[PDB]
Design a protein around this ligand. Structure first.
Ligand code: CDL
Ligand code: BCL
Ligand code: BCL
Ligand code: BPH
Ligand code: BPH
Ligand code: U10
Ligand code: MW9
Ligand code: MW9
Ligand code: A1EFU
Ligand code: LMT
Ligand code: FE
Lengths: 256, 52, 274, 325, 51, 51, 51, 51, 51, 51, 52
């Protein structure tokens, strides 16, 4: 207690070193638990990298997915990998950026890149699709803020492409996830979705600064107008953010 | 918003006025500020609820 | 190396002042124009710290102490071994921190994600900036910055804390601390929510957002939501960093007296029946 | 500028969401009344949900109010039931722990006897609330991470007022129940036992407390940065990761050389938060009981810095020079 | 020592303002009068003078 | 008179609890005010009366 | 003479609640400031009268 | 006068009884603590006073 | 003479509430100003006039 | 002469609210700074004029 | 003088007017208060000196 053993190493020192050993084990546990995705490492050529780091991959853990979606083991065989990427290396070595072969936004390679998620809509606790248009919502309505329905949509370059037809809401958590854009015949056809986190709503109009007017006709569509699958949901969101770098050369080129 | 933001703006203007109004008749800046802050919470909340 | 999905995101572009000249990766790190300046400033600042440690006479990490000059030197440059080295390391630290934040802008611009992280880091930079260059200017002496030591800068906090007579009564420190405790409280509960939902007892299905949303509805009667917690949590942490900047920037150049005596306005009001 | 997802630009309200429920049948003890607030909806969910009226929660609420009231009426009795003085001195009044000359023995009511009664009710309320968190996670078939994270806060809570006073030989080591008084206790505790800066476990707790705020600014901004990719839906990103998890990981892999998963982030988030009171609880528990002077502990363990300059103002200036005369 | 926040912050205006009672003392004080040989004391000049 | 029409506006189950907490809080506050004054503190008067 | 139609724009239950809170708060505030002055503090006058 | 039984037509017996039980005990505890505070009515201490 | 058209611009309910609380706050502020001064503070004047 | 075109670009309800708050704050500020001066203070003047 | 109407094609009349409207008042108020700051052009204290 108040007396020391082998030198100045008292009980406070013993507790301090005991925590040091525990923390080292904790850091190993914490770091390994983050290796369940994206591992093993690879090089720019796609082969397995010679170096895998100082932390070995953890034991396989299983998630009992709900709504009868089977099980899920994270370490090994990521099903979200995209096969045909439209990129080729700018250098024969490693550590250098890729240059898209074709249209970066259409192919979805850079900031426009999506992930091969499940081709099924996300489900709430009831088993119903999580994101649905507010028209199909039972008793939902705008409670505060500016209602964007009917407001014209202004692209990044200022072009007016159409008016908002509906908002795809998240009835499980009661928030807006998308805005439906009814494209004018000049700027495209059909309807397209833009995520709420990428859109800015003004008093009279609603604007997206990430995508120019000519790129709305190429926004990924949804197979059904009543629900969106995670694959389409990932493609749609990625496309708009891809325009933050690919709408024009001025965004990709250095700003100074 | 709009109405609520404007009502809050009326309160902070009233809070500033009460901050200097009590300073004129004495008090101090910190004592006046507390009444000004208190006024902003009270009349600002009341206006944002009743007017809007 | 690269992750299993990193190849696609490694595209050229999204640079502020640099171009393809610095647009490359070194290992996992991304080098840019500001990654070049970060590497230069961080290495120069780190080496000068050990150079000062060599001249200080000790290499013990606990005992290494690079201190600002005397208050008699004012805002001018001091001799290198008399405090001038601390000023240069401060200049290197500001360059390293600003470039690191600007590099993070290049990282997120290349990935198409928002600029929230570099902005959030800039608040922490502002807390350091207000501690080392803003407060000394308001006092007219570089000697008011904290020394660059593991335990020496703890002595500075202790001495500065008691230099205002029971710093606990500082109103901005009172606000800043309760943001620090709430952020840790929010971090624990939010981290627990996701882990609990994702890791149920063995033989039970994983819980979706609805199950974790209703847990605090049954726990504390209101749940801020999956999206709400991240934005309120960022503001909780940024307020903690911002109010920490306030509590130290109002200490010397605003309230030279004791901090309990600041509360004399509450104790002495006309409303109170003395 | 681009829309930063700090405040929602439009919010919708539908039928109130009661809960998920299962064969554990939580509905009977769940309230049937909910409300909606648009002011809080600008930053989070706008629904004021229904309390689950469990017995652990009710006991915690009733006994917690008993501790709150007992401290309150002693505070009101401090100033002789003078409400204007009670309001004026609200931040200064407290229910002081017993005098040190009583030890673990029960002290008189005016000299900490009501402190023990209030502390006992506070202990019951705090423990009952933890049992509520454990039971609620059990009834929801969820992980007990909330209960374990709370239990870490109980550790420092129990060390501060229960564990340390028991093995310090006196109830006087407990923390007074006051706004400013427990700040005075916090400062006096560091002064009495040297300097808690030089307590390694206090330093360790500070490391995790800064790290906890650091992570949750990192995590809060990173998720808001990938919220354009549905990053706020963390749970679905754990089961089926999209570009939100990948971009968030690659942002920090390209910045600091390594990253986390959408699930592994919360393990990092959980542990620094949990380690903050665990390390602090250890440091307080062995402060005074083991080490009675932390600076002297630092001196003998060679991590207290030494200064070669003079300690007097006369060595740097003069009184006339400071006054400008 | 430089480094550690051992300092006493004071406003320049406060430092420039002296103690208001200093000028009061200067108006009241006076130079002492050096006694000479065989100088009369307070006991002789006035009665009921304390020792 | 015709004051009974107030119940056509006020909800009886929401105003009865409103005055129920209000009346007790008013009663408790006034009792505390009397205890604060040394003239009307019947507890201290009993001690003084006994002497 | 034609003030009856104020309720055409004011909701009774919405203004009655505000009026009830306002009247009690005003009455308490006037009572409180009246207790602040020593001339109208009926508690101290009772103490002084019996002294 | 005798129509007080109609209070149960507004208040359900379950919620009022639970509120009543907590209120009465807290009121009883509040008053007992007040007497324990006063030196004249502290029956525990005056027992020690009587030898 | 044609000021009646202001209600075509201002909503009656929104503006009546706005000036309803503006008048009371103004009246209270002006009254509280008279408390601050010594010549027009009727509380001290009543005490002074009562000797 | 063509000043009436200002309403073609300004919303009458938006400017009037801004005009109303500006005029009162301007009037209050001018009144307040007037009270700060000793010369233009009708409250202090009346006390001085009376005695 | 009268031929400079081509500039108005660039500005939104609402934006420029409110910007210049608050600019003139802020500039006028700032000029008035610095006149109050000086000991020679402060017309409030000049009346006090004149009226003794
Ligand atoms: C160019 C110049 C630029 C500027 C330079 C100048 C900068 C000045 C400051 C310099 C600071 C150091 C620089 C950072 C290191 C750089 C390394 C690098 O770039 O390449 C990494 C290199 C790999 O090459 P690579 O380029 O990354 O290629 C990809 C990998 O192959 C693929 O593998 P991977 O996917 O797994 O990723 C690899 C990753 C894997 O590593 C990790 O997973 C990191 C996870 C742990 C970090 C989180 C811990 C922090 C939490 C709080 C810590 C503070 C409290 C701790 C103390 C109190 C509690 C005890 O490694 C890293 O990325 C390193 C990140 C930085 C490491 C942490 C930085 C130090 C933190 C502590 C501060 C110390 C003060 C500064 C040092 C003093 C310098 C003078 O080698 C390493 O991986 C380093 C090993 C990792 C460290 C061991 C951590 C495991 C902990 C368990 C053992 C702990 C024992 C202690 C307890 C004893 C028990 C009794
Ligand atoms: C006697 C002492 C007084 C006292 C006096 C002070 C003083 C004096 C100060 C504080 C300040 C703080 N006090 Mg206090 N305080 C006291 C008691 C407390 C208590 C408590 C439980 O008792 C608490 C919780 C706090 C809490 C705090 C926080 C509000 C704040 C800490 C700094 C911060 O926010 O980050 C701010 C700092 C930064 C964010 C650092 C930025 C980091 C940079 C950008 C990145 C670093 C990179 C670096 C190179 C590392 C890289 C190396 C490796 C490669 C990774 N105080 C005691 C009573 N307190 C400090 C403050 O506010 O600072 C603003 C301050 O100066
Ligand atoms: C002069 C002051 C001393 C000081 C003395 C202390 C003391 C004394 C302590 C700390 C401790 C702490 N100090 Mg220190 N500390 C100082 C300077 C600092 C500085 C700084 C920049 O200067 C900082 C950042 C810190 C930081 C910290 C944290 C790391 C740590 C507390 C973590 C915590 O919240 O636990 C979380 C736990 C709690 C706060 C209590 C948990 C509460 C319970 C669980 C909840 C009950 C709720 C209650 C019933 C109310 C409910 C009401 C609801 C509304 C319904 N200290 C100086 C040296 N410091 C603590 C420690 O040592 O940790 C090892 C501690 O005891
Ligand atoms: C500012 C608001 C809060 C916050 C946020 C925050 N911090 C951040 C970020 C964010 C959002 C990042 O994105 C960024 C990051 O990438 O973290 C991993 C970061 C960061 N904040 C960090 C640390 C940190 N954050 C802290 C706190 C906080 N984090 C605040 C509470 C603290 C405290 C107060 O204890 C520390 C120590 C780093 C991990 C990282 C910044 C990395 C960086 O700047 O890298 C470039 C520089 C180097 C590699 C070395 C530079 C060396 C210098 C040239 C010389 C030495 C200077 C220094 C002043 C000496 C110190 C001596 C002694 C006092 C130790
Ligand atoms: C991991 C460490 C961090 C942490 C975590 C943490 N805290 C937690 C949890 C977790 C994980 C919970 O699950 C739990 C919780 O439910 O949070 C919402 C909690 C909690 N930690 C809390 C506070 C808290 N946490 C703190 C800090 C921390 N806890 C650390 C930073 C601090 C500090 C040190 O400053 C405090 C003060 C609470 C919000 C909550 C614990 C509450 C609980 O469950 O029981 C406590 C008691 C009551 C609920 C009863 C109180 C009595 C009344 C409600 C008050 C009076 C009401 C009214 C005035 C009555 C009037 C009556 C008269 C009119 C008659
Ligand atoms: C859900 O979403 C999320 C994720 O999951 C998708 C995440 O993961 C994260 C990230 C958060 C995590 C918790 C993940 C794990 C991370 C941590 C535990 C750390 C964060 C917590 C802390 C308490 C901070 C601890 C700090 C650490 C670990 C240090 C990291 C910071 C540093 C500054 C050190 C690393 C930097 C280095 C080494 C320098 C950078 C390099 C350059 C700029 C390159 C420059 C090069 C040149 C110019 C060329 C010269 C080349 C040379 C000299 C060759 C040398 C080579 C080298 C490699 C050095 C978040 C927020 C998130 O929300
Ligand atoms: C010199 C060297 C000497 C070394 C000496 C130490 C060596 C070793 C000790 C072991 C170290 C192992 C460290 C690794 C840490 C990994 C722990 C972990 O994280 O694993 C988790 C288990 O969670 C916990 O263990 C919660 C921790 C309890 C909290 C503390 C309580 C406060 C108590 C306060 C008291 C504190 C005491 C003071 C898996 O959970 P999950 O998979 O997510 O969910 C599954 C689902 O079934 C939910 O039910
Ligand atoms: C003075 C300056 C000092 C630096 C001290 C460490 C130097 C010792 C390095 C000697 C071995 C070098 C080597 O030959 O190894 C190279 C580099 O390896 C490293 O990672 C270097 C070790 C990290 C430095 C230790 C951290 C400081 C010490 C902190 C650690 C613990 C506390 C192959 O690199 P790699 O191929 O990417 O490795 C992954 C793959 O091989 C496995 O799958
Ligand atoms: C209108 O309102 C009325 C009605 C007037 C009213 O009431 C208002 C109430 C008002 C104003 C009171 C407001 C309370 C305030 C400001 C106090 C803050 C409180 C703070 C800061 C707490 C710090 C210290 C906490 C610890 C650290 C405890 C440690 C507890 C330990 C762990 C308990 C351990 C148990 C025992 C020792 C018992 C042992 C015995 C047995 C087991 C038998
Ligand atoms: C806002 C970010 C920081 C920008 C800093 C700009 C201000 C820098 C101030 C430098 C002052 C140099 O002034 C220095 O004053 C000291 C005191 C004098 O010393 C005598 C020096 O002779 C003179 O060189
Ligand atoms: Fe999260």
């Amino acid at each position: 207690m108040e007396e020391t053993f082998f030198g100045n190493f008292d009980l406070a020192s013993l507790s301090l070193w005991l925590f040091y050993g525990f923390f080292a084990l904790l850091i190993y546990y914490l770091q390994t638990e983050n290796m369940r995705e994206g591992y093993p490492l690879e090089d720019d050529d796609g082969n397995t990298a010679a170096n895998q780091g100082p932390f070995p991959l953890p034991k396989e853990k299983t998630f009992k997915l709900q709504h009868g979606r089977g099980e899920l083991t994270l370490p090994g065989e990521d099903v979200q990998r995209r096969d045909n990427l439209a990129l080729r290396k700018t250098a024969h070595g490693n550590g250098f950026p890729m240059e898209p072969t074709g249209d970066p936004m259409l192919d979805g390679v850079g900031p426009a890149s999506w992930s091969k998620r499940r081709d099924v809509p996300e489900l709430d606790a009831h088993g119903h699709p999580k994101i649905v248009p507010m028209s199909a919502a039972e008793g939902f309505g705008v409670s505060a803020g500016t209602d964007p329905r009917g407001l014209p949509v202004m692209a990044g370059d200022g072009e007016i492409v159409g008016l908002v037809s509906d908002m795809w809401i998240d009835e499980a958590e009661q928030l807006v996830r998308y805005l439906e854009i009814e494209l004018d015949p000049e700027w495209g056809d059909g309807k397209r979705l833009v995520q709420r986190e990428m859109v800015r709503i003004k008093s009279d109009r609603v604007k997206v600064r990430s995508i120019y007017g000519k790129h709305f006709k190429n926004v990924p569509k949804t197979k059904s107008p009543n629900q969106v699958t995670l694959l389409e949901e990932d493609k749609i969101m990625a496309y708009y953010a891809g325009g933050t770098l690919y709408a024009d050369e001025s965004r990709l080129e250095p700003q100074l | 918003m709009t109405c609520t933001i404007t009502c809050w703006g009326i309160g902070v203007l009233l809070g500033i006025m009460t901050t200097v109004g009590l300073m004129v008749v004495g008090w101090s800046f910190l004592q006046g500020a507390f009444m000004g802050v208190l006024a902003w919470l009270i009349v600002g909340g009341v206006l944002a609820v009743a007017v809007c | 190396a690269l992750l299993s999905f990193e190849r696609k995101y490694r595209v050229r572009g999204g640079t502020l002042i640099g171009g393809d000249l610095f647009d490359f990766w070194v290992g996992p790190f991304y080098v840019g124009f500001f990654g070049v300046t970060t590497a230069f400033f961080a290495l120069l600042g780190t080496i000068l710290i050990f150079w000062g440690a060599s001249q200080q006479g000790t290499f013990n990490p606990w005992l290494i102490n690079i201190a600002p000059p005397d208050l008699s030197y004012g805002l001018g440059m001091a001799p290198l071994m008399e405090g001038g080295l601390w000023q240069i390391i401060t200049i290197c630290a500001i360059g390293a921190f600003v470039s690191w934040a600007l590099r993070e802008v290049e990282i997120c611009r290349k990935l198409g994600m928002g600029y929230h992280v570099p902005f959030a880091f800039s608040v922490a930079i502002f807390a350091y900036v207000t501690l080392v260059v803003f407060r000394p200017l308001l006092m007219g002496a570089w000697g008011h910055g904290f020394p660059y030591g593991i335990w020496s800068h703890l002595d500075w906090v202790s001495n500065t804390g008691y230099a205002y007579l029971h710093f606990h009564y500082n109103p901005a420190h009172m606000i800043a601390v309760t943001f620090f405790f709430t952020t840790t409280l929010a971090l624990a509960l939010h981290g627990a929510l996701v882990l609990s939902a994702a890791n149920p007892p063995k033989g039970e299905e994983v819980k979706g957002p609805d199950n974790e949303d209703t847990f605090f509805r049954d726990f504390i009667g209101y749940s801020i939501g999956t999206l709400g917690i991240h934005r309120v949590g960022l503001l909780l942490a940024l307020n903690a960093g911002f109010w920490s900047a306030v509590c130290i920037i109002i200490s010397g150049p605003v309230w030279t007296k004791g901090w309990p005596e600041w509360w004399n306005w509450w104790l002495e009001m006309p409303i109170w029946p003395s | 500028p681009e829309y930063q997802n700090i405040f929602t630009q439009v919010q919708v309200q539908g039928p109130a969401e009661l809960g998920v429920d299962n064969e554990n049948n939580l509905t009977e003890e769940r309230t049937t009344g909910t409300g909606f607030s648009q002011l809080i909806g600008w930053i989070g969910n706008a629904q004021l949900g229904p309390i689950y009226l469990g017995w652990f929660g009710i006991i915690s609420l009733v006994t917690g109010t008993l501790w709150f009231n007992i401290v309150g009426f002693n505070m009101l009795s401090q100033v002789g039931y003078s409400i204007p003085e009670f309001i004026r001195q609200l931040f200064w009044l407290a229910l002081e722990p017993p005098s040190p000359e009583y030890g673990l023995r029960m002290p008189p009511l005016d000299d900490g006897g009501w402190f023990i009664i209030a502390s006992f009710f506070l202990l019951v309320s705090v423990i009952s609330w933890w049992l509520r968190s454990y039971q609620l996670a059990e009834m929801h078939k969820m992980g007990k991470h909330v209960a374990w994270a709370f239990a870490a806060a109980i550790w420092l809570f129990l060390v501060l007022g229960l564990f340390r006073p028991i093995l310090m030989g006196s109830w006087s080591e407990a923390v007074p129940y006051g706004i400013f008084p427990h700040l005075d206790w916090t400062t006096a505790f560091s002064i009495r036992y040297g300097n808690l800066y030089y307590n390694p476990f206090h330093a360790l707790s500070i490391v995790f407390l800064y790290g906890s705020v650091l992570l949750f600014a990192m995590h809060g901004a990173t998720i808001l940065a990938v919220t354009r990719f549905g990053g706020d839906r963390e749970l679905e990103q754990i089961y089926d990761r999209g570009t939100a998890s990948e971009r968030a990981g690659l942002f920090w892999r390209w910045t600091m050389g390594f990253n986390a998963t959408m699930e592994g982030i919360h393990r990092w988030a959980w542990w620094f938060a949990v380690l903050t009171p665990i390390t602090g609880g250890i440091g307080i528990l062995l402060t005074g009981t083991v080490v009675d002077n932390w600076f002297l502990w630092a001196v003998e363990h060679n991590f207290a810095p030494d200064y070669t300059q003079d300690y007097g103002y006369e060595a740097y200036t003069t009184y006339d020079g400071f006054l400008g005369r | 020592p430089r480094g550690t926040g051992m300092s006493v912050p004071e406003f320049v205006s406060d430092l420039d303002t002296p103690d208001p009672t200093i000028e009061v003392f200067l108006a009241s004080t006076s130079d002492p009068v050096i006694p000479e040989e065989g100088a009369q004391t307070a006991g002789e000049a006035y009665e009921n003078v304390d020792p | 008179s015709k004051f009974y029409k107030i119940w056509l506006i006020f909800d009886p189950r929401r105003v009865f609890v409103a005055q129920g907490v209000f009346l007790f809080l008013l009663a408790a506050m006034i009792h505390l005010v009397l205890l604060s004054t040394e003239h009307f503190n019947w507890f201290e008067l009993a001690a003084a009366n006994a002497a």
